[PDB]
Structure formats: C-alpha cells, structure tokens
Amino acid sequence: STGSATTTPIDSLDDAYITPVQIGTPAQTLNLDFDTGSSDLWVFSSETTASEVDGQTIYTPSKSTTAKLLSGATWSISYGDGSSSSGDVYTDTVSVGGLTVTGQAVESAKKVSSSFTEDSTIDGLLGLAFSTLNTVSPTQQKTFFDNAKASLDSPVFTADLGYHAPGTYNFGFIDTTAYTGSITYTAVSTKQGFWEWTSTGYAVGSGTFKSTSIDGIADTGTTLLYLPATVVSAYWAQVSGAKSSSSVGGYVFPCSATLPSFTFGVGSARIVIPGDYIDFGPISTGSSSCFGGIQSSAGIGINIFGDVALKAAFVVFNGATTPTLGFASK
C-alpha cells in the first residue's frame, strides 16, 4: 500500500504545516502537524477542557463506531518549546492520504497548554519519530508509520515541504519526479528516539564550505534551523546589523537586509537553503527588526534541522531494519 497527502503552511511564514487526517467511522477529518521529532498521535477532542479549545476541530470518539477506549491508558507530553498536552487514549481507524491503519492509538487531549489553544489551525500532532518515544502509559503505543510499515510497498515516508506553498507527505514510495539529481543517504542513530544524523559541514552564502561534523535531528515539527553557536554567528556576521537579542530570544536582523543562503552537507552532497527561507518577518507587527530562521542550539542540547532546512530538500525517512535518511535537492 501507499499514501500521499498534501501538507499546507498554517500561515504566511511557514510556522508549521498541517495535513488532513481521517479518524474514525464515519471519518472525522482533523488537520494535524506531522512531527518527525515526536511519537504521539494526539488530538483535540470532545474531552478537551472547554476553555482550552478555541477554533480547533475536535475528535469525538463517541461518534465513531470503530473507536474503543484503551482501558487504563494515559499520556502526557512536553515539547522542546515548552508546550505540553495530556489525556487518555482510544484506538480507532486512521487514514492519511489513502493509507489506512486500523487500531491506531489516538491520544485524546483532556488538557493542552496555552500555545496549542492559541493556534486554531492545528488540531493535534501526528508523531513520526521512533515509537520508543511514545508517552502512553502503562503500555507504550506505536506510531502511525510503525503500524503501517509492514503493509507499505517500501518501509519509507518522504517529506517535501514547500516554501510559502503546500507540499507533500508520501508513505510507502519515493516519487522520483519530486526531486532533482540523486538522493544522498546518510546514517541514522535511533539511540535518542529521533531521526538523528550527522551533517558534513556548512557554507554561508558564496563562501567556502567548512567541513565539520554537525550531529542533529531531522524534525518537521520544529520551524527553524538550530545549530551550534559558532555556525550561527558565522551566518549572521554576513548580515549587516544582525545581532543576538536576549530580550527577543535570538538573532534579529534589519528587515531591509537581503539574506545570504546557507548550505549544509549531506555526505558529499550539498543542500542550499535560499536566503529568503531564513526570513521570519517582523518581531512584532510594524517592526523593522526581523526574526532570523537560523538560531543557536546552545540552550537546547541538540541541533535541530527543522523546517527551514528540510523545506529546501526532498527528504526520505527510510524505516528499514537499519534506518537511514536521504536528502535530495528539488
């Protein structure tokens, strides 16, 4: 089997991408944030505290003839940005782009943190990291991909995120028309539960490529590119007037600037992020200070190849017995 679904930016900055997901019978379609950095499929629901729902579409398990309470199961998650959610668990039929999994754990939120409530466009998350990170207790549950894998034509999914435009998540096949050149595959460590890999270096603009190992994770659920402070300083040094602002929370730059590209290495291959992809717009409405799309990871503990990096590439998440990642230009 295969599936293919369009993923759409939630706003004009590509802060996140939403993909429609059919849950239950009859289908309830919710727009979920596909997140290769986490492993829970959780949704706003009829159980979510009413004051914490503000415009999201909810899953109502009592209206699904295939929903079953997973007795005794609870979940609770905290994300790298400080947000969180928790609740109970149903199993139900879940379909993405024509690919159907029966008995998928659907984690129904009883509580969500304010950042979720305040984003009316995201109805939940669909985790695509390794199932070892799933938070369901006392019986850990499998991700949608893990449940689908054995049925897929090939045990892979691909992320093709658009710049200021829709893109595509495919399951079970590699669309050879969706990229240019060849796909370069690179090793993955699953020891932390992530799609963790090592970039071979970077370049700023038209500058020389610096060969250096940068371990990080491919994370579709993170907006920006978080790299070591040395790398990030080298980038922003090429933008007149750019500086790190402790009060804003990162590098800012004059909105009048033209940003240089940023290249990262995948083996001997190179992925070029155009400068425009690194502009996240005014820090507040009407400001002439703009927020940068490349930020330091120093306070995180891990480097994160988020959407800024991934949307410059066609990305293969190869879930074979020994997982690997593939990157192609497009």
* Residues near 258 by beta carbon (within 8 Å), at least 6 away in sequence: 275
In 10 A of CB 156, how many CB atoms? 22
Contact present, 122 and 32 (Cβ < 8 Å): yes
CA distance 112 to 32: 15
Sequence-separated contacts (24+) of 114-119 with Cβ below 8 Å: 115/81, 115/82, 115/83, 116/44, 116/52, 116/83, 116/85, 117/52, 117/53, 117/54, 118/54, 119/10, 119/16
Residue whose pair of structure tokens reads 């509580």 in the numeric block: 111
Distance CA 323, CA 188 (A): 6
Q: Which of 35, 40, 88, 279 is labelled catalytic?
A: 35
What is the resolution of the experimental data for this entry, in Å? 1.0
> Helix (H, G, I), strand (E, B), or coil: what is residue 233?
helix
Query: Could you tell me the end-to-end alpha-carbon distance of the chain, in angstroms, rounded to an integer?
Result: 25
258-262 long-range contacts, CB within 8 A, separation 24+? 260/204, 260/205, 260/206, 260/235, 261/204, 261/205, 262/202, 262/203, 262/204, 262/205, 262/225, 262/235, 262/294
CA 231/CA 214 separation, integer angstroms: 10
Reduced to 3 states (helix: H, G, I; strand: E, B; else coil), residue 276 is helix
How long a stretch of residues is the chain?
Answer: 330
Q: By C-alpha distance, which of 181, 203, 327, 326 is closest to 263? A: 203
**C-alpha separations of 26 from 65, 204, 228, 283 in Å:** 7, 51, 48, 43
Q: Nearest Cα to 1, choosing from 168, 144, 143? A: 144
| Strand 124-127, strand 28-35: pairing | parallel
CA 65 – CA 83 distance, rounded (Å): 32
Is the separation of the CB atoms in 220 and 161 below 8 Å?
yes
Copy the structure tokens of residue 12.
């004009």
Annotated catalytic, 62? Answer: no
Strand order, beta sheet including 250-254: 243-245, 250-254, 289-292, 279-282
Backbone angles phi, psi at 234, to 5 degrees: -60, -40
Domains of the chain, by residue range, sit at 5-174, 175-330
Q: What does the alpha-carbon distance between residue 184 and residue 264 come to, in Å, rounded to a whole number? A: 13
Confirm if 18 and 7 have CB atoms less than 8 A apart: yes
Instruction: Tell which CATH classification among 2.40.70.10, 3.10.20.30, 3.40.50.720, 3.90.600.10 matches the domain 175-330.
Output: 2.40.70.10
What is the distance between the alpha carbons of residues 96 and 29, in angstroms, rounded to a whole number?
A: 10
How far apart, in whole angstroms, are the C-alpha atoms of residue 19 and residue 6?
6
3 state SS of 310: helix
Contact, 220 vs 34, CB < 8 A?
yes
* Residue found by looking up tokens 């304010």 in the block: 114
d(CA 184, CA 59): 39
Q: List all residues 6 or more positions away from 7 whose beta carbon is below 8 Å from its beta carbon.
A: 17, 18, 19, 34, 161, 162, 166, 167, 168, 169
Query: Do the domains 175-330 and 5-174 match in fold?
Result: yes
And the tokens for 147?
Answer: 């449940």
Give the method used. Answer: X-ray
Alpha-helical (H) ranges within 74-161 are 114-117, 144-148
Residue 55: CB partners within 8 Å, gap ≥ 6? 120
Whole-angstrom distance, CA of residue 14 vs CA of residue 21: 20
SS3 119: coil
Cβ-contact 107, 43 below 8 angstroms: yes
Catalytic residue among 39, 199, 261, 297: 199
The verdict on whether 54 is a catalytic residue reads: no
Nearest to 232, CA basis, from 210, 257, 254, 247: 210
Contacts of 114 (CB under 8 A, 6+ apart): none
Three-state DSSP class for 327?
strand
Options 3.90.1150.10, 2.40.70.10, 1.20.1270.10, 1.10.10.2160; CATH for 5-174 is: 2.40.70.10
